[PDB]
Design a protein around this ligand. Structure first.
Ligand SMILES: N#Cc1ccc2ccc(Oc3ccccc3OCCn3ccc(=O)[nH]c3=O)cc2c1
Lengths: 547, 401
């Protein structure tokens, strides 16, 4: 008998201040009991478990579905936290093409790895005897139990520790380790490849690990985590979109999820109109009707998902390029590729929740997102193609009050183009009329007034119902914009309005702000000045709108 | 050579903090560095039984192409027990010149308390989560930890004892992995003394605090004022009234009477000139009742003035500035706002360390996502401060300009 190498155990403790689980064993049918007896007998013969004495206070419930099922939920609640390596998953677009790729599954997976003996007494469970006229049969685990909290992490770390020297001794081949499967790859010849596969499974066999002896049970394409992995390309598993004349909130969530999943390779996926129906959630049962926007959008989604699209794999010797397009209504789409027309992957960005905004900011945010994603997947920042002129970006970031940056990028001309719709003067305008504006409102009656007086004698006051101070202060400025020439100076005491306008939105949720913007767009020169209210500042008339 | 027992604060588990993505080159740099450190016993590989994690990344200091390992020990620091205290050298800021030295390599000589080592666990990440990250833990005193200088205080005292007994006029301060040395010598004599001290540390960044002071509030001096000029002036004075008690603007506001064109010149009345003069006299004096409280946080606000110019204020209570300044230094940052901001934050933090012996909480004029995406690309400092993000443009921008 060849002395296979042992495996050092991972020391495991319970959470501090807690003791091992003790739970009452469930009553079982005689059939179930017999089945469990046979199974546990076979397992004990294999060495996965061992009988224990009455001394052990701890117990875990066991069931039969034959296959046994040990409910370790309580122990999991009482077991220590572990370091999980499954946070995030490898994205197929990040993989590098290999001439040969073989799959070795680890049959006899968790049961080939020993458990820390000091912890085995906490995994104890009992089998109810027939008619309970004898003491139940007591067992404990000697290996990693299925369903236990610490099994996957310990298994992964152990397998890594075993594989490390072989990997170091074979830099010319790449080995990926995922759960109960190992994926080996190489740019070598097919014979040398199969040979090194045999070497690897031998090396694994040295620790007493078994791999498929026959021709490997799985071959390309690989169906993995919703992906299809072909030799020369990758894509997603076929979409499933339910069609029903009555939609619930949960169905909307599932549809949104599947569309978002499909959007990583299918360009032009839009999900806004269907996501707007997820306001007032937490009720999974409901009937939500469709708008024409949502129906046309879903029809367009069925239009894009009509024919299959494939992404390619990553070649480090070629540059990484990300191109962005504006779709409207705060929607943005992007493609990451190296060769033209051959995408590595695609995606979308939706603007955040805010009262005001402009295109340049959203573009910046989109770029940040793509940058982070690209650093995750390929470990580098891609060169960007943006629908914005160099001069536009220049003016924007030079005059913007916040600090802002975009990595290396070039201008691609693919309308709509992102542009600055208006720019405020830095200095008062000579020969331009000066509108002193003001607005006020009564907190009780919600009645107010908004208006202006100018240097040329021009005046206006307009009475308003159902309005607030902020609204009247905006309305005054809007009035001044309406009744003035292509060049105008405007004096206000509204820190609110000045803040809004200095934020430079091209679009807003407030119709009044939108109208002010539309006014600013039509203007040639606009200087917006500010003064403190109620300081007795001449020309600024609180007395005109407070009547 | 003898480990001192270190615990955490009551009711606090060790830090679990997500490791953020790194570029391939930084990953490779960290792999090389950590391999070497492992070969030197400074760190050791750990298993899955360790849940704890602290962020880590790579940088490049001034005048060096060699990558460096920086660990974001912020969470661990605030979760680590308070270590005891040496009163801050209030004369350090009063000195003519101060030179900062990196004494981090010294810490790796002293071993870390065994039971505590599991809290310093960190992960070298992998691209695309292909293989599980390389997990390490520290065996010796880690750089960036607040306990490392506290433990090494005795040793550092013993090492710097002869130099202190030699030059009583030289002030020595220590913060984290940095040693601040103040004096009143000449730049050449300064550099030679620094070589002497570094050689004294071997066998075992010129900064001039005098060229930096606080800043007053100045008003324009004009022969002729337009309506706009007077409006802005009134705005600024009105703002400054929140700080200085006796500021009055009624006589200047009296000039604005009526509705005129913004570009129209208004001659100042005698009362207006008098009022303006009084306001000047008031602004020349310092601020009433401004004290420092060691039990209160330091807050720093930074405004972008454009053209590579930046203004900043350090305070505790609003309108009670402890320090003000204006960073306009341009090195290689001309086309990048974020780099400028990062260097500004570093400089202000350093000044704060020199004056009070602790870092301020920043209020950065940048979107969270942008800053979080790029700030590690331009960070040369061994420490890190805390920061928040102001999304609303401040009106006081030109009032510090
Ligand atoms: N964690 C993880 C994980 C999960 C599933 C995987 C499936 C296939 C695979 O494959 C690879 C395994 C080792 C090295 C290079 C690989 O893929 C490069 C691209 N590729 C793909 C499929 C194919 O048939 N041919 C190819 O060239 C690696 C995998 C890794």
């Amino acid at each position: 008998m060849v002395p296979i190498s042992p495996i050092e155990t991972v020391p495991v403790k319970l959470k501090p201040g807690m003791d091992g689980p003790k739970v009452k064993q469930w009553p079982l049918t005689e059939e179930k009991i017999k089945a469990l007896v046979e199974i546990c007998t076979e397992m004990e013969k294999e060495g996965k478990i061992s009988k224990i004495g009455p001394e052990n206070p701890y117990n875990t419930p066991v069931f039969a579905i034959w296959r046994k099922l040990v409910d370790f939920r309580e122990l999991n609640k009482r077991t220590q936290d572990f370091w999980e390596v499954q946070l995030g998953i490898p994205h197929p677009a990040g993989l590098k093409k290999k001439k040969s790729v073989t799959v070795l599954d680890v049959g006899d997976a968790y049961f080939s790895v020993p458990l820390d003996e000091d912890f085995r007494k906490y995994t104890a469970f009992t089998i109810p005897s027939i008619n309970n006229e004898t003491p139940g049969i007591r067992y404990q685990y000697n290996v990693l139990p299925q369903g236990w909290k610490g099994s996957p992490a310990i298994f992964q770390s152990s397998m890594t520790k075993i594989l490390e020297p072989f990997a170091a001794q074979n830099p010319d081949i790449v080995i990926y380790q995922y759960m109960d499967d190992l994926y080996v790859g190489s740019d070598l010849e097919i014979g040398q490849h199969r040979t090194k596969i045999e070497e690897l499974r031998q090396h694994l066999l040295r620790w007493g690990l078994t791999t498929p002896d026959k021709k490997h049970q799985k071959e390309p394409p690989f169906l993995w985590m919703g992906y299809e992995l072909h030799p020369d390309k990758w894509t997603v598993q076929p979409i499933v979109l339910p069609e029903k004349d009555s939609w619930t909130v949960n169905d909307i969530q599932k549809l949104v999820g599947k569309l978002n999943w499909a959007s990583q390779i299918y360009p032009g996926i839009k999900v806004r109109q269907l996501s707007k129906l997820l306001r007032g959630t937490k009720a999974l049962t409901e009937v939500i009707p469709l708008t024409e926007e949502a129906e046309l959008e879903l029809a367009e989604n069925r239009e894009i998902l009509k024919e299959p699209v494939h992404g390619v794999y990553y070649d480090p010797s070629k540059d990484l390029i990300a191109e962005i397009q504006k779709q409207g209504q705060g929607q943005w789409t992007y493609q990451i590729y190296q060769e033209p027309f051959k995408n590595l992957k695609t995606g979308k960005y939706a603007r955040m929740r805010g009262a005001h905004t402009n295109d340049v900011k959203q573009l910046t945010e989109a770029v940040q997102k793509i940058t982070t994603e690209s650093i995750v997947i390929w470990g580098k920042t891609p060169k960007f193609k943006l629908p914005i002129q160099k001069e536009t970006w220049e003016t924007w970031w030079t005059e913007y009050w916040q600090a802002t940056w975009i990595p290396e990028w070039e201008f691609v001309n693919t309308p709509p183009l992102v542009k600055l719709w208006y720019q405020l003067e830095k200095e008062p305008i000579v020969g331009a009329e000066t509108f002193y504006v003001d607005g006020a409102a009564n907190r009780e009656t919600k009645l107010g007034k908004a208006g202006y007086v100018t240097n040329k004698g021009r005046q206006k006051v307009v009475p308003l119902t159902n309005t607030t101070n902020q609204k009247t202060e905006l309305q005054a400025i809007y009035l001044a914009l309406q009744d003035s020439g292509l060049e105008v100076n405007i004096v206000t005491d509204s820190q609110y309005a000045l803040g809004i306008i200095q934020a430079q939105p091209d679009k807003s949720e407030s119709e009044l702000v939108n109208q002010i913007i539309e006014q600013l767009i039509k203007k040639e020169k606009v200087y917006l000045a500010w003064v403190p209210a109620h300081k007795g500042i001449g020309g600024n008339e609180q007395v005109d709108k407070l009547v | 050579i003898e480990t001192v027992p270190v615990k955490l604060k009551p009711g606090m588990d060790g830090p679990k903090v997500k490791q953020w993505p790194l570029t391939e080159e930084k990953i490779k740099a960290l792999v090389e560095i950590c391999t070497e450190m492992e070969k030197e016993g400074k760190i050791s590989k750990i298993g899955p039984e360790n849940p704890y994690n602290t962020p880590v990344f790579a940088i490049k200091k001034k005048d060096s192409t060699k990558w460096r390992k920086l660990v974001d020990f912020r969470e661990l620091n605030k979760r680590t027990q308070d270590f005891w205290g040496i009163p801050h050298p209030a004369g350090l800021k009063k000195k003519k010149s101060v030179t900062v030295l990196d004494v981090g390599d010294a810490y790796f000589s002293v071993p870390l308390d065994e039971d505590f080592r599991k809290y310093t666990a960190f992960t070298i990440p992998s691209i695309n989560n292909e293989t599980p990250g390389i997990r390490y833990q520290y065996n010796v005193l880690p750089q960036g930890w607040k306990g490392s200088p506290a433990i090494f205080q005795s040793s550092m005292t013993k090492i710097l004892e002869p130099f202190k007994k030699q030059n009583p006029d030289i002030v020595i301060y220590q913060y984290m992995d940095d040693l601040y040395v103040g004096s009143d010598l000449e730049i050449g004599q300064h550099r030679t003394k620094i070589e002497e001290l570094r050689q004294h540390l071997l066998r075992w960044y010129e900064l001039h605090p005098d060229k930096w002071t606080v800043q007053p509030i100045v008003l324009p001096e004009k022969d002729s004022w337009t309506v706009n000029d007077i409006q802005k002036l009134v705005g600024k004075l009105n703002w400054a009234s929140q700080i200085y008690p006796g500021i009055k603007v009624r006589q200047l506001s009296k000039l604005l009477r009526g509705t005129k064109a913004l570009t129209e010149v208004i001659p100042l009345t005698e009362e207006a000139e008098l009022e303006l003069a009084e306001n000047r006299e008031i602004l020349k004096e310092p601020v009433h009742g401004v004290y420092y409280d060691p039990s209160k946080d330091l807050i720093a606000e930074i405004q972008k003035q454009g053209q590579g110019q930046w203004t900043y204020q350090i305070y505790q209570e609003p309108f009670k500035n402890l320090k003000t300044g204006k960073y306009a230094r341009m090195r290689g940052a001309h086309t990048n706002d974020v780099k400028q901001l990062t260097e500004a934050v570093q400089k202000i933090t350093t000044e704060s360390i020199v004056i009070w012996g602790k870092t301020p909480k920043f209020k950065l004029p940048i979107q969270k996502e942008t800053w979080e995406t790029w700030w590690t690309e331009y960070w040369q400092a061994t420490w890190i401060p805390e920061w928040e993000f102001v999304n609303t443009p401040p009106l006081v921008k030109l009032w510090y300009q």
